[PDB]
Design a protein around this ligand. Structure first.
Ligand SMILES: [Mg+2]
Ligand SMILES: [Mg+2]
Ligand SMILES: [Mg+2]
Ligand SMILES: [Mg+2]
Ligand SMILES: [Mg+2]
Ligand SMILES: [Mg+2]
Ligand SMILES: [Mg+2]
Ligand SMILES: [Zn+2]
Lengths: 94, 131, 176, 136, 38, 141
RNA sequence: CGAUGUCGGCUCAUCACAUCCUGGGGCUGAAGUAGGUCCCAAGGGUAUGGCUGUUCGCCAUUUAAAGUGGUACGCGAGCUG
RNA sequence: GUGAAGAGGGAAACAACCCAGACCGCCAGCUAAGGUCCCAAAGUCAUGGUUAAGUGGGAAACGAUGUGGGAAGGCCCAGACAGCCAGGAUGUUGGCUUAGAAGCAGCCAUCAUUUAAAGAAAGCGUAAUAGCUCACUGGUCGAGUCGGCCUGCGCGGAAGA
């Protein structure tokens, strides 16, 4: 039921990722095996508060991108070593 | 009652009713029957006075700086809305008996009647009324 | 901000003169003047006083509460005044007031004469305790503090000068 | 004494302390003490903090020491000139990078864990924080 | 007065005050928790 | 506010001290504070006596702080200390008890009166003898 | 290193305060006397002998006290050796 | 790489650091680092904010209602946080090795009701006594308030000739 809007990324690389993370946004990825992987960026604090709920990895999420609704499932997450911040999450279409 | 300046009108003034408190009358009759609501208050004015009123404030957070001067006799009376009444005019007079007579005259309910005051104790129904 | 947002009523016709920012009040028992901190503007609403911080001073909200408390204390004092009572507990302590000069015998070697600031009256109904009444709270409190300061209460027998309503904790000789 | 036995080589290079920690997550326990600083951390110090850890509960719970020194540290003796060899080892430290989960534990209330972790952080030499297990 | 570099509320009645740019603890219960500096 | 209303009996059976084991979370439901038994049950009461029951007026108020008064042991058990028996009621024709002194009984009743009320403590005294007879503890002159 | 004379003593000092005394305060397991500890304070003051080259240390007797350090472990174009 | 074997401008002074490699002259101009209130040429420039410490213009662990900002909380008109309240229900002389502990040493650890507040620790001192209060609910004057997380800039920590 958790629904997050998100804007497609335009720049990839360490520099672009760090520039995003310095503006309270972190990148992420949508893939589904038989579908073209999609780069995405999504707001940091909204999903960080979504994180506390144990249902985040349990239920099916709804990602909104340029007016498109897709249903996905959180695959994995990598976090900052010491601060409670996220660099990047992995999403599987489902 | 619109704001906390009207929250005000309920944070000491019944100190005047609780300073010399010598009875505890409680009842859970949420039935707001007009005939009985000029029965009980009129009897209060007929025997004791207008000191007691219709404030049915009973949630778990109301009556400690409720009656703060005496009367633990109410101190554990707090389920779903239960009216409260004290009695000044003549220590331990007979308000409770006519309250019970109205209960005989079909007040709906009275949650956990215990003969509140002058057992200094539990359930007993206040057998003696020392007027 | 609540104290500041609480206009103080004015009794029967105590004289009130706001000449700029130096409020003067003339009660039936006294007269008191006080220049206000520039951050506050106080207006006479024909039965009371209202307080407002001037724009440009970040401390106005805190300062105005002090101003309201101060003017309330002033109006109370010039209405009827304040009174502080001290007890000289301990064998060998005596007190007596002549004029505005209070002689204390707390037993050092010599009696101690204290001069009052001339607006504060003193009285001694019983010889063991003193009652001093004043038209201004800060000064009556200061003079009471000075009277206490000569022999502040020793916490071992309660001996010394103390306020009436202040209760001293004692202590033990701990062996004998 | 929290010291390795049968070490392959008696003495080890000073090395460098660089990069981010590996075991950043809490795995065995429910509450962990994650280091947000950097720097070596001596087996004597781990012993002190572990004693404080089991002392805060006085018996309770399960604890895990996720950091093992396995790094000999040599000290040149007093009043001896430089050179003429490399001094003998004197103590063993663990190189700690930011994010490493030093202490881990479960079986006690979270607040009691907060207190115990504070007590041991008082003995530790680098900045720490309290972290809880996450679903990941 | 304990003149210490880490002041803390030693009991329930301790109060923290910043008097003239320095941090102090005053307790009305016992005159032994009085702290300074910090 | 809270003077006294809602009165039952707690304060379970009586030997030696320091709370913890027997009667816990039953109290533990609602809030009487925690170590409240070592300033009228390890630093105020007993050495009037060390084993058997007494009634103690025990309670904390809404801010969870204690204060106590005393009472006198009920005659069901106080005469166990007085006469020193381990017998009891249930078989009066098979297991019965011997006599007890009236001066001792009046001493017990004097403690009773000091630790209770009643308009005529002498008129109330004989009820202790009656209770002794009802439980089968013979009290005589 | 085509020289930068040294341990201790004598005379003369001077500065710092992390105060030995005197001064002002808290807190006390501060009855009082006497203390313990901590904070502020550098104005002034801060032994004499026996032993040893000794600084020091030990001893004897005082004193309100016999402070700790810096100054080329002050001071040999000032002395002694 | 620079000095050695490199002058010039900057960092007060300062072979190595920053900029830049002096053929000579010129009372011409544009720039580099670095700066523009006065010493000393150039902004007492413009805009939006931060700090109250002379921080700037030395220094940590640790401590704190300093202050600015962000996100999410509980709690509340079945009315919140603090004021005054009065604060003090009981089969316990609990299995303690039944010499002394008897609402606050070590103990073993946890049966309930009446039933708005009523969980065998928190402190003052008494071989051990009494007595008062805090983790707590609330009747008038009260509403925005209670405690945490992320942070920016600050405060103490901070004593030498
Ligand atoms: Mg001052
Ligand atoms: Mg000093
Ligand atoms: Mg010489
Ligand atoms: Mg080269
Ligand atoms: Mg050069
Ligand atoms: Mg507060
Ligand atoms: Mg600092
Ligand atoms: Zn305190």
């Amino acid at each position: 039921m958790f629904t997050i809007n998100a804007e497609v990324r335009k720049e990839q690389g360490k520099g672009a990722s760090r520039r995003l993370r310095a503006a309270n946004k972190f990148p992420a990825i949508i893939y589904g095996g038989k579908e073209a992987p999609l780069a995405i960026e999504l707001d940091h604090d909204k999903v960080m508060n979504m994180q506390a709920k144990a249902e985040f990895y349990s239920e099916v999420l709804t990602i909104v991108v340029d007016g498109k609704e897709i249903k996905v499932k959180a695959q994995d997450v990598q976090r900052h070593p010491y601060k409670p911040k996220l660099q990047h999450i992995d999403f599987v279409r489902a | 009652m619109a704001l906390n300046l009207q929250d005000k009108q309920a944070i000491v003034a019944e100190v005047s009713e609780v300073a010399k408190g010598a009875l505890s009358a409680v009842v859970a009759d949420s039935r707001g029957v007009t005939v009985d609501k000029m029965t009980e208050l009129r009897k209060a004015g007929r025997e004791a006075g207008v000191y007691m009123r219709v404030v049915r404030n009973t949630l778990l957070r109301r009556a400690v700086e409720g009656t703060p001067f005496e009367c633990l006799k109410d101190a554990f009376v707090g389920p779903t809305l239960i009216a409260y009444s004290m009695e000044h005019p003549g220590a331990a007079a007979r308000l409770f008996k006519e309250f019970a007579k109205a209960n005989a005259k079909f007040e709906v309910k009275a949650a956990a009647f215990e003969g509140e005051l002058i057992p200094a104790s539990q359930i007993d129904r206040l057998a003696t009324l020392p007027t | 901000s609540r104290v500041a947002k609480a206009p103080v009523v004015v009794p029967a016709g105590v004289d009130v003169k706001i000449n700029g920012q130096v409020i003067t009040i003339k009660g039936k028992n006294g007269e008191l003047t006080r220049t206000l901190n520039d951050a506050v503007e106080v207006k006479h609403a024909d039965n009371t006083l209202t307080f407002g911080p001037r724009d440009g001073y970040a401390d106005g909200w805190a300062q105005a509460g002090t101003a309201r408390a101060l003017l309330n204390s002033m109006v109370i004092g010039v209405t009827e005044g304040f009174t502080k009572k001290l007890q000289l507990v301990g064998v060998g302590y005596r007190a007596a007031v002549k004029g505005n000069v209070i002689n204390l015998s707390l037993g050092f070697s010599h009696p101690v004469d204290h001069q009052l600031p001339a607006g504060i009256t003193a009285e001694c109904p019983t010889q063991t305790e003193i009652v001093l009444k004043g038209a201004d709270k800060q000064v009556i409190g200061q003079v009471a503090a000075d009277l206490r300061a000569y022999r502040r209460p020793e916490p071992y027998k309660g001996k010394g000068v103390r306020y009436a309503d202040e209760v001293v904790r004692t202590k033990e000789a701990k062996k004998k | 004494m929290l010291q390795p036995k049968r070490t392959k080589f008696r003495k080890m290079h000073k090395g460098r302390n660089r990069g981010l920690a590996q075991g950043t997550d809490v795995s065995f326990g429910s509450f962990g003490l994650k280091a947000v600083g950097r720097g070596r951390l001596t087996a004597r110090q781990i012993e002190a903090a572990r004693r404080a850890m089991t002392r805060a509960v006085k018996r309770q719970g399960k604890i895990w020491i996720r950091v093992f020194p396995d790094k000999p540290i040599t000290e040149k003796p007093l009043a001896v000139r430089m050179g003429k060899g490399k001094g003998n080892v004197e103590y063993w430290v663990a190189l700690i990078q930011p994010g490493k989960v030093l202490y881990e534990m479960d079986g006690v209330p979270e607040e009691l864990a907060r207190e115990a972790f504070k007590l041991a952080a008082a003995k530790l030499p680098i900045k720490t924080t309290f972290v809880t297990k996450t679903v990941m | 007065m304990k003149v210490r570099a880490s002041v803390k509320k030693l009991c329930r009645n301790c109060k923290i005050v910043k008097r003239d740019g320095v941090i102090r603890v005053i307790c009305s219960a016992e005159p032994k928790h009085k702290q300074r500096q910090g | 506010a809270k003077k006294v209303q809602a009165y039952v009996k707690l304060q379970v059976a009586a030997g030696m001290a320091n709370p913890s084991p027997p009667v816990g979370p039953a109290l533990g439901q609602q809030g009487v504070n925690i170590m409240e038994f070592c300033k009228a049950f390890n630093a105020k009461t007993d050495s009037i006596e060390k084993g058997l029951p007494i009634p103690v007026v025990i309670t904390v108020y809404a801010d969870r702080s204690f204060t106590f008064v005393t009472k006198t042991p009920p005659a069901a058990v106080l005469l166990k200390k007085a006469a020193g028996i381990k017998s009891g009621s249930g078989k009066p024709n098979k297991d019965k008890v011997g006599k007890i002194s009236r001066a001792q009984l009046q001493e017990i009743a004097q403690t009773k009166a000091a630790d209770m009320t009643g308009a005529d403590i002498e008129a109330m005294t004989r009820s202790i003898e009656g209770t002794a007879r009802s439980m089968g503890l013979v009290v005589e002159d």
